[PDB]
Structure formats: C-alpha cells, structure tokens
C-alpha cells in the first residue's frame, strides 16, 4: 500500500532561525562560588606541619596552623641529602628536557630509575609517565579492544572509570569486596564462552585497587589470586595509596600478605607524588608488556620527557628506604592510634561513622543515614538515580539542593575548628557530574612521619568537640 | 671564543687533497634506488637480476 | 655492557661551557626584525613534485617489502613454533598483542630501528653529547662502551636557547628550591595552591593579552581532560584533519559528533557549516545546541600557518566558537612573541579559548588556558584535573616566570629581541640556501621547522648514518606518520647556532645529497621560473645579504 | 552488561554486515584511514600498467608460446589483485579500537562510496586486458573458457553494486556486526 510522497530561497531562513546555547551556563556560578573563597593559600613557605595561610583574597590570615591535609607521608624529600642531589643535577642538566621520548629525550638518568624500581619492587621492568592522573587511561586501552571482557569493582575511582569508557569493551561490576559475587559471575562467563565455541580466547581482566581512594578499605589478594588462576583471568591493581605505607619496608601490598609480585599481580599503577615526593607515575610489569607500551601508549609516545631533578631525587629516596625502615614504623604507630581514638568514642556513635582500615594513613568520616534523613531528608540511593537520569537526557543544568546542604554543613565543621582551635582538616573534593558510581561527602584527616604523638592526641580531641558543637 | 667540538674534515676537501668514480656512482645508483637496506639476509635477490645476462645475447 | 652507562660529568672552564651551550654573535648584521601583516591575506600555498619514476620505484619497493614480509611471517609461523612463543596461545591464555595489528613495526621499522631512541647526556644546547652503541643481530640488542662524543644539535625543541645551566633562570630555580621544597602536598583544591601559582597565572594573563588564565602540570592533560566540561552528545566539532592526538582523545572522551575538513580549504568548511546547520542532529533533525571549531596555530610537520581572519569572520557570521592551539607559536613568532594574533594583528578578544605549552620555548614543563572571566570561573568548578590530580612544582614555576619576564623586558634588557632576530635570520637563511641548492623545502618563509623531502624509503637510513658519521644530529619520519610517497627530514632551528655552523651543515648536506641524488626541483620554487643548480661558495657568498629581502620567497 | 560491545557470528547461506551504530560510525571514523587514502594520489593509476608490462616481459624472457604467456599473465594479475584487495579483512595498525575489523580495503575506498572514478578505472582494466589478450588463443576453446571464467568470477563479480557487504558461510562462519 504505497503512500503518496527544498527551495534555496528558504535555506537562509533556517540559518537565521538558529539560536545557539551559551558556552558555559552562569546561572549557578554564584551559589557554588564558596568553594574558591574557602581554599587555603600558603604564603612564602613550604607546605609542612606548621604553616601560615590566607583565605578569601588576603582578607583573613592565620599563623602557626597545625596541618592535617597533606598527602605526603614519609617526609624524606626535605632532608639535606636529597637537597644536595637536586642542586647538583640542575647545574649539570638544567630544568627542562626539550624533546619527546623517541627523539633524543632520554638523558641516561631515566634508564637508571627504571632499573632501580624493578629491583626494589621485584619485577622485570618499569615505564615512566609524566603525570599520574594520565597513567591508567593510557595503559588499559592499549591491551583491550571490542569483544573483550573486563570485570571491575563497584567502588573504583574516576581515573579508572575513564579508562573503562575508552577501552571499548564489555564491562561488568561485582559487589564491593564480595568473592561470592565475583566467583558466581566468572563461572557463567566461562560456560557461555565455551558453548559459543569461539575460534580464539579473548583477553579477560580483573580491575581493583589496593587501598581505595574514596573509602579507605583493602583488597583480599589471596582470594583473588586463586580465582584468577582457576578461571584463567588476569589481575589489574592500582597502588597509588598503598606503596610506602604497607609492609615491613614499604614494598607495597604484596609484602603485607607475604607474597610475590611477579605472579600475584600483572599490572601495577603507582604515583611518585603521594609519598616519594616527586611528580610523575610509573607502570610495572613484565618485558613483553613494556615493549608494547613504547609504541602503543599515547601518553608515552606523544609527550615530552620528565625533568631530570625529579628522577634523581627519587633514586636517593629508594636507596635510603632500603637501608633503614624507621620512617614506616613511626607512620604505622600513629595511624593505629588515630583510628582507635575515633572508633572507641561513645559520644559520636549516633552522629558519624568511620569507614577506614587501621593500616590506612587517612581517616574518613561519614554521616549516619539516620541523621542525614532526619535533617536533609534524602537517601544515597535516591541521590544516585536522580543524577543518572540527568546525564542520560543530557540536560545543561544539573543542580541538586539536598546535596549542597550537606557540603555546607561539613564546611562548618572544618571552619569551626580552625578559627577556635587552629587545626586544619580538609573535606573531600569531588565533582558529581563526572561520577558514574555512587559517592557521598566525607571528611579527611591525614598523618605523616614528622609528627609527635602528644601533638596528634590534642588535635584529635579538639576535632571531636568541634563536631559535637556544630551538630 | 673556543668550544669543545671536533670538526670532521670533508672528503674531497682537505681529506683527499692532502678511474674508479664511475663504478662507485653506478653502484650507488643501482643500490639506493632499489630496496636493499630494509632487507636482511636477502642479498640473494641480486641473483634474480640475472636478466642482464639473458638480454646480453642477441640473435 | 648491556645496561646504559652513567656518565661522570667532565671538568671544564666556565667559558668553554658557556660557548658549548650558547653561541656568541660575531657581527651585528645577522639579525632580522619581523613585520606585521595588516591587510594582506595568506595566499594559497604551492607545492612541488618530483618526476614519475620516483613514485613508481617507491611503489615497487613497498610492494616487494609487503610480499616478502607476509611470506616470511607465514612460513616461519607454520614450519616452526618454538621461537615464536610470544605470539601463540599458552596454557589457555591469549597473547598480549596481535599478529596483524603490529606488522609494520616488526617487519619494516625493526631493520632501521638504530635511527630511533638515541640516548644522550648533558644539557641539550648547541652541542649535544651522545653515548655510542653497537648493533647486534638485526637491531635486537645493543652493547654500550664508556665513550661519549659531541654532535651538532638539529633535533631538539629549543627555539630561544633557554636550555642553559648558567644564567638568571638557574639561580631563580635554585633559590626556589632553597625556599620551597620539591614537595607538593596534593590537588590544587585541597592544599596544593600557593602564592606563586597566583603570580604565574596573573603574569601569563597579562603577557598573552586576555583577562585571566590557569596553569597545569602536563600539556597532554590540558587537552585530554577539557572538552568533557562543556560538551556533550548534542554538539558538533569541526576540526582539521591534522591535529594532535590529545585533541582527538579529548573529543573522543567527550562524545560529541566529529566532522573533518581538508587542510587549507575554506570553501569546503563553509559548505560543511551550512549543511550541518541545515540538517541538524541525526535521526531527529533538531538543531545543534552549539558548534565549536578547532584549529592549530603552526603545523609542525609542514610549517604552515592557519588563516585566522577567515575563521573569525566565518564564526562571527554563522555564530560559532573558536579554539586555537599555540604550542609552536608562543614566544617565537611575531614582532614581540605574542603569537599568530600579533602576526595577523587580530585582537585576542575574538578567540574564545587559547592554549599553550612551555616546553618548546621556555625550557620547562606545563600548559595554560586563557579565556574571559566567567568562562574561567565556571571551568574552575567544572574541571577534573584541578581537584583530582597533582600540582605544579616550584622550580618549573620559577623557570617559567624568569623566562616570561626576560622575554617581556622587565629584567635582563636587550636579550629577547636579540634572540628573536637571531632565530628569524637563521631560519630564513637556511631555507633560502636549501632552496637555492636544488632541494625541496616546505613551509612559510619564517618557520623554525624546515622539512626536507626524501622520497625513496632506502634513502632515510643512509642519510641518517652519513650525517651521524659527520657529527650532525637529524630526525627522520616515514609511513604511516607521513604519506606513502612523501617521507621527510625535519630541521629544528635554535637561537644558539651561528652562521659558521650553518655553513658547515650546508656544505656537508650538499655533498651528501649530491652523492645520494636528492636534488629534484621543478622550477616552481624559484621566483623567476627557472631551475636552480648553484655552487656552495656562490650561495654562501650571496645569500646572507639577500636573505633579508622578502621578494625571494614564493610563500 | 553496562557497555554491550560484542561481535556476532550468525550463520546463514546469505548474510550482510549490519549497519554501524551511532558511536561506531559517527564518532570512531573521523581521522584519515591511511589505508585507502593513497588510492586517489599521484602515480596510483599507471602502476597497474607498469606491473602488467613487467609481468609480460618477465614471462617472455622465458621463451614460451604467446598463448601460455598471456594466459599466465592474466591469471597472475587477477589473482594478485584479488589477494591484495578482496581476501584480507581489517587493517595492519590499530585505528581507534578495531572499528574496521569487518570490512575489506575495497569497501573502505572513498568512505564506502559506491561509484567513484577510481572504481570505474579498476573495473575497466580487466576487461580491456581480456580483449587484448584473447586474440592469441581464440583457436583453443578450453583456454578461452578458462580465461573467461577467471575474469568473470574473480575480476568482475566482486566489483559490482550487488555483493557489497556480502558474506557466505560456506568456507567459514563469518562475523557480522
Ligand atoms: C605450491 C604452491 C606455491 C604457490 C602458493 O601456493 C602453493 O604458495 C602459497 C603461499 C600463500 C600465502 C601464505 C600465507 C598467507 C598469509 C595469510 O594471512 C595474512 C595475514 C592474516 C590476514 O588477516 C586475517 O587475520 C586477521 C588477524 O587479526 C583476522 O582478523 C579478524 O579476526 C581476529 C581473530 O583474532 C579478530 O580479532 C577480529 O575479528 C579480526 O581482527 C582476519 O581473519 C583476517 O583479516 C591471516 O593470517 C595470520 O593470522 C593467523 C591468525 O591469527 C595466524 O595464525 C594462524 O596460523 C598459525 C600458523 O602457524 C597457526 O598456529 C594457526 O592456524 C593460526 O594461529 C597466521 O599465522 C597469520 O598468517 C593470507 C594468505 C597468504 C598471503 C597466502 C596466499 C596464497 C599463497 C601466496 C600461495 C601460493 C599461490
Ligand atoms: C617472481 C614471481 C612473480 C612476481 C610477481 C608477484 C605478484 C605481483 C602481481 C601483481 C599484484 C597486483 C598488483 C596491484 C598492486 C599495484 C602496486 C601497489 C603497491 C603497493 C601498495 C601498498 C599498499 C599498502 C597498504 C597497506 C594495507 O592496508 N595493507 C593490507 C590490509 O588492508 C593488505 O592486506 C595488504 O596490503 C595485502 C596483504 C597481502 C599479503 C600477500 C601474501 C602473498 C604471499 C606471497 C605469495 C605470492 C602472491 C602473488 C601471486
Ligand atoms: C608539541 C605539542 C604538544 C606536546 O605537549 P607535551 O607538553 O609534550 O605533552 C601538545 N599539543 C600540541 C598541539 C603540540 O603541538
């Protein structure tokens, strides 16, 4: 039943009727501008235990502020021996590299650090990267294409999420630290793969983290190793926050469980800025992996080489860490004391909870769901579903009122302690638009090896009183 | 103004200054215009160029 | 022997080191000032071609290479498997990479791999020191010996000669190390920000000419993590076919529709804009939410400039937005060094977003973005790198601030202009001499990158090895980076080189090219329409005076 | 699955490659292919004539009869072109994530445009070669039939409006979508 079915004069009418949208929406800029005004700024002195800060365009100034918002833990890069190596290199090498990796870019100090990392961490090779934020999304896509299988945890960080989106492969999720969910999921995938009788076996990976960035938990490595060999998978572990703080010496997560890295883990991603004290990152693995990254990684091939003084300082730190292991022992004693001081308090049970392991050097605090529902009247499950719909529908404006109220309340806790007691504790900084998995606001208190137990104890009591007074 | 740099004397200019050029030129023309350098162990492909012997005989 | 040696620094007097890193001008007649084009549009570029037999020989060579490579792969992987244990399944596990996706690297480039990844040492100034190595098997593994020899530098991104270990910048960096440690606390949102960051941002904003600017630690991350902040699946991006991989990665992460237009073709761009405005989104025909145009200032592989006024008038007429990258144009192009905007005289207010990198000219590592006030205020809250990544170290900030202040003229008077004049004169002289000899040279008259075409694939290793034997460092590129017919050698000029070094390079290059028969000019390079096969002495005698005149350059 | 990126291997006598989705087509094919761009370039049309002349001269250097020489040169040229273009599927270098893993080089020419001058030339060459070659072995009917069969079945049928994105599962379970 076939049914019965433009002029150039009206083409310009369509062009003139087009009304484009602004590049950036300024409607909600004013209401969300308090974050910039509350950012501390250090004045002419390095970030250390005692600092002098100014906020809100030099309007307010504080002197001798106890610092608890620094990611540096070992504090070995401020010592005299490291400063001697840094100054000598500049006089003989300069500050810049001036060249890519493949065009006269290696200055025979980059090769030395690659050898040092493999011997210290017990692997076969290493590859250096300019920035840690651009390491995971540059190595994972190189070994995965369409038709592959990736199994990931439901609490991974944003940089890991970016890698899985660009990987262009099937992605599955299992419950947070649940081997029953993982083992059940793997069995079905293997059986259907055998049933289809594919000509070749595709690549399969497992993605997890050592110490989680948003919660502070651990991963049960002995269980994962047994399952991956049983079902013929591969393990991918990110160790940004677990190298230098776990183990007798600081080798990483494998030394904590008394294992071998050559067989337990296949890909390791780390950062040199958290504990070592220098910019950059690295990826650890075997020889066949490394040769493919020299030509298959976009970040490695299409970027300038890392400066020279950063490389030399890290090698000195690694040599010092091998001889003596007193910095790690001091860090672990303080971390255990900090966790127990916030977990054995009966006055904070009905207000906040602790979601961190004792071995972690950062303590995370979150509001109880009963208290959040009483005041703000919203649930994390409800918050997740609202943002998911907005992203799919591609709306220009993404503003949620109950979410903003909690952020302001947590800022009041931070501000109250600093003004009255001169203690600086930070707040977790996240962007809700870019997230894909559920997340909630929290607080953070850090520790390092340059502190004294008496000073830390007084700071803990002050923050506990600050929370109660605000609530 | 002195720098720690060594200058390589140029051939045909203060190198040979202080019957065979035709053969060298012909060899360079034969070699560089054909695909030989990116080959390994394949110097035996020159044997395939025996067509000169085949076309040498006339009538 | 297998491991790369660690070289002990040599002991030399100060003057020898300064001469090694930076040259001293001989006469004041080797400087040139760059004029500004007020109302002269860029003419369409003209290219030159070699005769047909070069192309036919190239095609035959590639055909033979492909046939023998595939035959070798098949026979070797069928008749034996013990040696090829990295490309077959083992204990039920797939291999790391695939056979077909890595054919070129293993079968063509591996035989000439000695020309890539050359270790060096010391400062990358006028003379660069290299470590010797001995090739084993067929470029499989190398053995190193304790010997280091200097070489002339023509392969490093050092335009204004800021890669020095003796000067104001080094002292500033050392003082910064003394005051601020090399430690960075964390992300800029939490603890990372200090006063030096604000000083650098304000100074950059004042130097470029916009209202405000931000700083970053890596140039790649500036592009890779930017477009997702204000683009979505209902926007269109029109970009040139020749853009860096960072832009493509950022757009892929964003998810917007991508349409490309041919390089140097404005009519096709206008047609594409009109058609995309009329048609709308696929399958629904709703109008596009917004349209963004991406372009780059100077293209490094060809040394050609983009036509800015045409893009500005097109975006003003059709209500679009513009994005300009200035990695190779900042600090080295223009009467002062502002960029292509100063060359063309276009006000910076027209361009919505500007970008740059400090590695190519200022001898540091980082990047920046410059825009209006409200755009930056929103992007600061909406960005990912600010609140998830590390922060810039202090010595790099000190080096960048010192370099920008020196170029601006606040400190060390009479240095930036002299460097700019040196680099302009060097580029013009080298390009004119190379064209007069009989070679093929691409690009505009004043461009630090000089690409010389070497068509036959077998002529790259020979040229590179002969140049290395004569103590000159060169960089060669080939397929698939460049088209199949056209393979080229890239020259990067510096302000530290001297006319005597240029003469030395010209003599050696001319004789090597005569040996390898690389002179193929069809007469379209000459302004008088005749073939040019001169002598080296005549060129050396006449070119430096005529280098300043602008009537000897076709484009 | 949260992404659902899988390759199908449906088995049938006649099947076609499914149309690409929005993400695979409108976004993952944006940069130059670098595998089919060299066709519309300089010196890409005379090289076939040069190859034909070289093959004919190489066979004539042996000193055989014209009939065998011309039959062998026709078969060799057609078989070589088929092996180069129609047999292999994919690309030797990673493009984005494996976007062109279901198509040959012939389908990728000129962005899947059905009628372009280069395609017309590539179709015209075998016919003219056959007309020039048949004049030496018209007497033998078996060789004439063999040459006609080779030309029609290898050098004519694939280069047609039909048999575009056409796969047959007889020699192996092909992959579509
Ligand atoms: C007496 C007379 C004298 C004269 C004469 O006749 C006889 O002399 C003879 C001499 C003959 C040649 C000999 C050899 C070859 C190479 C062959 O190949 C090309 C390269 C490959 C081409 O591409 C395919 O391969 C793509 C790969 O990605 C596939 O991609 C998809 O499938 C992916 C699957 O993963 C998915 O990812 C995605 O869906 C997607 O990417 C896709 O199918 C297809 O594009 C194919 O072969 C390679 O690939 C094989 C598989 O990996 C290798 O392994 C295999 O061979 C091993 C050997 O030990 C064994 O262990 C096992 O069998 C097994 O492992 C093999 O070695 C290796 O060559 C093509 C034919 C040719 C030129 C012959 C022609 C005829 C002659 C000239 C005869 C001449 C007339
Ligand atoms: C003395 C014996 C006789 C000698 C004669 C030998 C055979 C010559 C016969 C003529 C052949 C047809 C001529 C047409 C071609 C004209 C010239 C083209 C010049 C080369 C073009 C290079 C293009 C590169 C593009 C890269 C690309 O994308 N590649 C792939 C994936 O897309 C293609 O799959 C790939 O290239 C083809 C792979 C084919 C592998 C060949 C395997 C054959 C093994 C050898 C067996 C003999 C074969 C010949 C009967
Ligand atoms: C040269 C260049 C780069 C290099 O940036 P890195 O600082 O080396 O990461 C990036 N983008 C463009 C457009 C370039 O020209």
UniProtKB/Swiss-Prot annotation, chain A:
Molecular function (Gene Ontology), one example: serine C-palmitoyltransferase activity
Membrane topology category: Multi-pass membrane protein
Cross-referenced InterPro entries: Aminotransferase_I/II_large, AON_synthase_class-II, PyrdxlP-dep_Trfase, PyrdxlP-dep_Trfase_major
Top-level class of the enzyme under EC nomenclature: transferase
Transmembrane region(s): 260-289, 343-375
Residues annotated as signal peptide: none
Family that this chain belongs to: Belongs to the class-II pyridoxal-phosphate-dependent aminotransferase family.
Other notes: Present with 22400 molecules/cell in log phase SD medium.
Domain notes: The first transmembrane domain is not required for stability, membrane association, interaction with LCB2, or enzymatic activity. The second and third transmembrane domains are required for stability and interaction with LCB2.
The protein's name in its UniProt record: Serine palmitoyltransferase 1
From Swiss-Prot, chain B:
GO biological process: 3-keto-sphinganine metabolic process; intracellular sphingolipid homeostasis; positive regulation of sphingolipid biosynthetic process
Superkingdom, natural source: Eukaryota
GO CC annotation: endoplasmic reticulum; endoplasmic reticulum membrane; serine palmitoyltransferase complex
A GO term for molecular function: enzyme activator activity
TM stretches of this protein: 45-59
Description of the deletion phenotype: Lowers the level of total sphingolipids and increases the phosphorylation of YPK1 in the ORM1 and ORM2 double knockout background mutant.
Disulfide bridge map: none
Subunit structure and binding partners: Interacts with the serine palmitoyltransferase complex LCB1-LCB2. Component of the SPOTS complex, at least composed of LCB1/2 (LCB1 and/or LCB2), ORM1/2 (ORM1 and/or ORM2), SAC1 and TSC3.
Biological role stated in the UniProt entry: Stimulates the activity of serine palmitoyltransferase (SPT), and thus plays a role in the biosynthesis of sphingolipids.
Protein name per Swiss-Prot or TrEMBL: Serine palmitoyltransferase-regulating protein TSC3
Source organism of this protein record: Saccharomyces cerevisiae (strain ATCC 204508 / S288c)
Section covered of the full-length record: 4 to 68 of 80
Curated annotation (Swiss-Prot), chain C:
Keywords attached to this entry: Acyltransferase, Cytoplasm, Endoplasmic reticulum, Lipid metabolism, Membrane, Pyridoxal phosphate, Sphingolipid metabolism, Transferase, Transmembrane, Transmembrane helix
Topology of this chain in the membrane: Multi-pass membrane protein
SUPFAM superfamilies named among the record's database cross-references: PLP-dependent transferases
GO biological process, one term: ceramide biosynthetic process
Enzyme Commission number, as recorded: 2.3.1.50
Pathways involved: Lipid metabolism; sphingolipid metabolism
Alphabetical list of Pfam families matching this protein: Aminotran_1_2
Transmembrane segments: 51-71, 437-457
One GO cellular component term noted in the UniProt record for this chain: serine palmitoyltransferase complex
Cofactor: pyridoxal 5'-phosphate
Cellular localisation: Cytoplasm; Endoplasmic reticulum; Membrane
Modified residues (N6-(pyridoxal phosphate)lysine): 360
Record has Disulfide bond as a keyword: no
Annotated consequence of substituting residue 328 to F: Loss of activity. No effect on interaction with LCB1
Molecular function terms from GO: pyridoxal phosphate binding; serine C-palmitoyltransferase activity
Family: Belongs to the class-II pyridoxal-phosphate-dependent aminotransferase family.
Matches recorded under PANTHER family: CLASS II AMINOTRANSFERASE/8-AMINO-7-OXONONANOATE SYNTHASE, LD36009P
Subunit text: LCB1 and LCB2 encode essential subunits of the enzyme and form a heterodimer. Component of the SPOTS complex, at least composed of LCB1/2 (LCB1 and/or LCB2), ORM1/2 (ORM1 and/or ORM2), SAC1 and TSC3. Interacts with LCB1 and TSC3.
Function: Catalytic subunit of serine palmitoyltransferase (SPT), which catalyzes the committed step in the synthesis of sphingolipids, the condensation of serine with palmitoyl CoA to form the long chain base 3-ketosphinganine.
Name this polypeptide is given: Serine palmitoyltransferase 2
Natural source organism: Saccharomyces cerevisiae (strain ATCC 204508 / S288c) (Baker's yeast)
UniProt lineage: Eukaryota, Fungi, Dikarya, Ascomycota, Saccharomycotina
